[PDB]
Amino acid sequence: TEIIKSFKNFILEFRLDSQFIYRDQLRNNILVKNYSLTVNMEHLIGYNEDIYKKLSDEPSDIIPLFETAITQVAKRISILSRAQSANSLPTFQLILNSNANQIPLRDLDSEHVSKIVRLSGIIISTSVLSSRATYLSIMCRNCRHTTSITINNFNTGNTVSLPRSCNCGPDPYIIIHESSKFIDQQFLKLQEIPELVPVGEMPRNLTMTCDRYLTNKVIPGTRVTIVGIYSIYRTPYIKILGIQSDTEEEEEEFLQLSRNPKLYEILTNSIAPSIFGNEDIKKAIVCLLMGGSKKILPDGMRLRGDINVLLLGDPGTAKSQLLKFVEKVSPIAVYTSGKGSSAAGLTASVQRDPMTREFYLEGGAMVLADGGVVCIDEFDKMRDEDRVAIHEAMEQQTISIAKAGITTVLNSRTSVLAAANDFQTTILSRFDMISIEKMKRYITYCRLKCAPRLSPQAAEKLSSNFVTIRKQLLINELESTERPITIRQLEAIIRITESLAKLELSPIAQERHVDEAIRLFQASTMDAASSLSEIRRFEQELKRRLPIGWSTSYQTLRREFVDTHRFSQLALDKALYALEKHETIQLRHQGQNIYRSGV
Amino acid sequence: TFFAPDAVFGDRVRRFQEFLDTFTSYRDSVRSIQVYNSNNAANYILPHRIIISLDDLREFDRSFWSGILVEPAYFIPPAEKALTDLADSMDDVPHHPWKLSFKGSFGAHALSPRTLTAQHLNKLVSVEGIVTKTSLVRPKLIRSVHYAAKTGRFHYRDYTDATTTLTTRIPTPAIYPTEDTEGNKLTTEYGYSTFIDHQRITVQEMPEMAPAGQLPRSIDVILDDDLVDKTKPGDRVNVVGVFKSLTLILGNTVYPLRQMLTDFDIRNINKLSKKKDIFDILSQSLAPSIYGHDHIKKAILLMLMGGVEKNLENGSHLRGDINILMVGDPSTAKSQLLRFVLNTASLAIATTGRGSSGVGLTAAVTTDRETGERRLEAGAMVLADRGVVCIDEFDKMTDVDRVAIHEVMEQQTVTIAKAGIHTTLNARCSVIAAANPVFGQYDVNRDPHQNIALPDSLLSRFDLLFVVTDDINEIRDRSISEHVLRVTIPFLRKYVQYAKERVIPQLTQEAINVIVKNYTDLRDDNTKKSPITARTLETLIRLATAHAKVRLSKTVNKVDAKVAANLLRFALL
Amino acid sequence: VDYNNLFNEITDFLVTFKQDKGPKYMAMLQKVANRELNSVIIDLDDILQYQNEKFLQGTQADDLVSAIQQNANHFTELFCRAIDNNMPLPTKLTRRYFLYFKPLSQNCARRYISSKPLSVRQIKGDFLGQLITVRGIITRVSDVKPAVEVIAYTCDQCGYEVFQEVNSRTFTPLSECTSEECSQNQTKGQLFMSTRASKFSAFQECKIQELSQQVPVGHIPRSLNIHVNGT
Motif span (Arginine finger) (chain B)? Predict the structure, then answer.
């Protein structure tokens, strides 16, 4: 009762910036009927030392007393506000967030059980929004007697249980389904950050119970900081009571290392300890972390800053060894592979909660990499249900999902660093290129602090380079080589220059970065470099040769083109796919028949 | 019923009788219901419900209003008992229940279904949105009549639901009887046995009021016999029911049926209404990250503002929507323009054109074990009914969706007949298609018909076909790098919606003759480069109207037909 | 609604008809006693004329046409026993005939409603149990198949053959003996089925479709199922 008056004095007497922060928030939440309020732990430890230590030691018996004091002052607020202009009040659930400590998942021990606990992680699953009760009328089936039972904060050997007796014998009770209140609840799963998890074992997880006011406030796959009670059901579980989400010598030595003029060069002499050669691959790998200049234009049509890099070659040459260094170096990155992996998947997986076979989702490396890069191996082994998602996310950053009940557009600031060994257009068009703690700290400070730009003095060299490459590769392109040159590659060149000028922590760009950028781009163009006739062939063939097409299929073209020495299977199926695709609906028809009719 | 009524029922039934004696608007309405039923019986029906205006209930009784708003399980019952007693007292001929309905403002009880949570369970909820599924109509069992044949007489035992009660009474089952007393087989009769039909529909939030980017939350409505013929998918609806949790709503009232405007913004759009330089700077101000293509975004500006949607008397409606197809080399910003038109329109739905789980965008069939039946899922085009939809990679889209957009183009609707249902939906939307050639690249010397990889009927369906060339030229390509290396967003939205809501343009004689001259001069292109159809006549004035409503004039002008002919010369030649 | 006087009205109607040999219903019973026909057709026009004859003589009518129209499944099992109470002797489970009905036309309706041409969109739901006259095209028909009505079981131990009545689409075999001799016995001997003493019926399903000009604007012509039996 004294704690009731203390919490009421804390609500109606706390001042910050010459104003109350809880009274107006309670009035605004009562006026929209939200039945919740945000309290901070720092304000109550600055107000009273008789509250926080008892809340940290015994939260389960002091928290509903605070809750009933909140409803007691809320009833007065409601009756004085309803009488001004234009009964039954539920128990107001409180949410409480703080940032005083962030303990890891490996520091959880046998000590401090059922206490307050605050930690970060990645929500993998929040599939079920099940139902419980908060007030229920119960009746008997034998002596016609009824009553009711109320619960407020306790939502497997717990308080909730029906009475065995009111003779009527054991269990004569029937729940009056016509007069009750339903309290939605959720079962969620949380795991630790996979960028900092030991290599010998997979990351462990934890189960948590989510109440009513914070239901469906967390999308699975983000950096979520959860504060609650570490309770035991032996097995541990978390009762959520609050939710939120996203050394000077280090900066001194980083500023001393930033003043070195051969810094880029030693960085490259440091990312390759045993890799012989490939300086242009190493500079493109180290320049594809941040991306480019993110600019928020006032018209709303902003530009993308991140880029794409692709590794290709024979097995070996650290195609999967440099990826471990980019997994352990970058701020947010998770190692995965093509078509998922063993009990983990890059694509948004979906499977059965084994309790009573529920459908729910498994976040891969695509939702968990919000604001960073993604890194995969074996690009040739991709499923068709994940290729469309990565096809849209590599150029639009957004991943859309829609299935029974869940429809969402996930933001995926995810650059790709893939390795490999209709696929031709997605390889050649969607890809632009074909201490350690102090370095990571400088990378995070540069990604959050600066927003560079470009000078026209260094942009005229880019314009002259574009004019010369368009005037020089047109000789190879009008000569029917059919391989390209776009403005997207020019925008990628601009993003590469922004990343190279951003690494020295400068908002301006000069010719010093563009002379390395054109040298970085020329290796990608050298790797990339190494209709009237085809349609005359195909069309004249169909038209003037076999209108039924029968007898004229893959054999006969194989003969003609074989005997005309112009056939390549890729070229054959290319002209053909062009014909079905130009909707020669005769070519549609022949495909339907003669193709696997064969000749 | 069997229990004795207390004063808690008698006081509420006399208060509803005093409210009905004060307001005769429901008494003469139920007398009209009875005289209409008597006239139809004399010739040989209405589903026995009276909508109650809630505005007369607030000033008459505050406590009764508060009791209806916080306890309808204890307040609705006695009001319908008073209505059945008033129906028995108002009629004096010889010889069924009566229900109620509400309307009007609710205050904080009127809310979005995504904000609908575990609070205010027993209280009645008014919630608007869009329906996704409408189940099959199913009759239930109540009062079967059995005939015992050896002694020859009738028996009857009735059943009770556990939802249609809005309150409390003892609940228990009963075996469907197969043997009367002592023991002799007895037969069923369904001639007189009532089969009250029920329905189970699903409704989620509207895409314009919801914070788009999130997931939609849907709820289930259990429907009685009376209102089973007024629900169909694809329409905006507002349901009024009770959030019962045995979680669903017992829908009793269904009504089938966005930036704020100040007085300072209307002065700015009235100031910008008479200058003859407005159109070019408004077309140039939509996307500054894309160099060039002024006439294409001029048509995109005329496209997102709309048409007129003329509905003819006693005949079919006329298409007001415009459709645009854009082709060319894949080097430019065709995939970057869809994000701008998705983020800057009133409401827009973008799809990839390949990857739809159903049969396409419009709908899909599903099986549910709840009802043990088959329900309908609405994937896309049926959600946006007045906005715009964007389909990139048009050549990868299969023939099923092509047959669907062949039918919904000028038709401006759709129809479906499936196992257990037959219906037609209305959806006047505008399509923005973006395609790529099958050869990968295209130049002027190649023919402009086979490079498109689409049938001639789809060329006739789409109104404006925009070809974007990208041959390497050293003169024009010098400033793209400095332009991308270097009026507003909340103003044009208010401009477009005020033009869409207030001004409707009409034709004049000054703009009929020049468009007649242009259509007869092109019907040249048939011998030189492109076929001209009759549908194009309609699209040649739609755009004019567009320009005339861009300037928000009450009627069209000759310059609107001139700028439509200029857009035609750029998109055709 | 009473059955004790309406059954007397039903059994008084078939013996007092002179409006349309002689007493035609007794002649039809003589014809079914001569074993030449198996179908019985009952019209409401004779019912209306008998009601007019009973009403003009000052007697109580006790209306049949307002009672035949609702719950005809009870009436086809109730009036059948009234036909079964009186039969003439032949000169040349035990149902030799098949009972069927037909409604009155509009010409007998204007000359002193129950038979209106109904659509399948004009069904409303609440007409489940009224006699309805539907107009439409027929697209789907099925083959004639024998559906059982009562299953006959025979025993060699007692001799009392039992008969069970099925109503649904499926059923279960009654392997346990429910006779009047096996109840007072330790032995509960095997039972067999008879496909000859069991009564069958020529069942056929059909799909009626909605008429083309009777469908509304934009709607599609949905179907409905009709289950026919007998002749």
Answer: 460-463
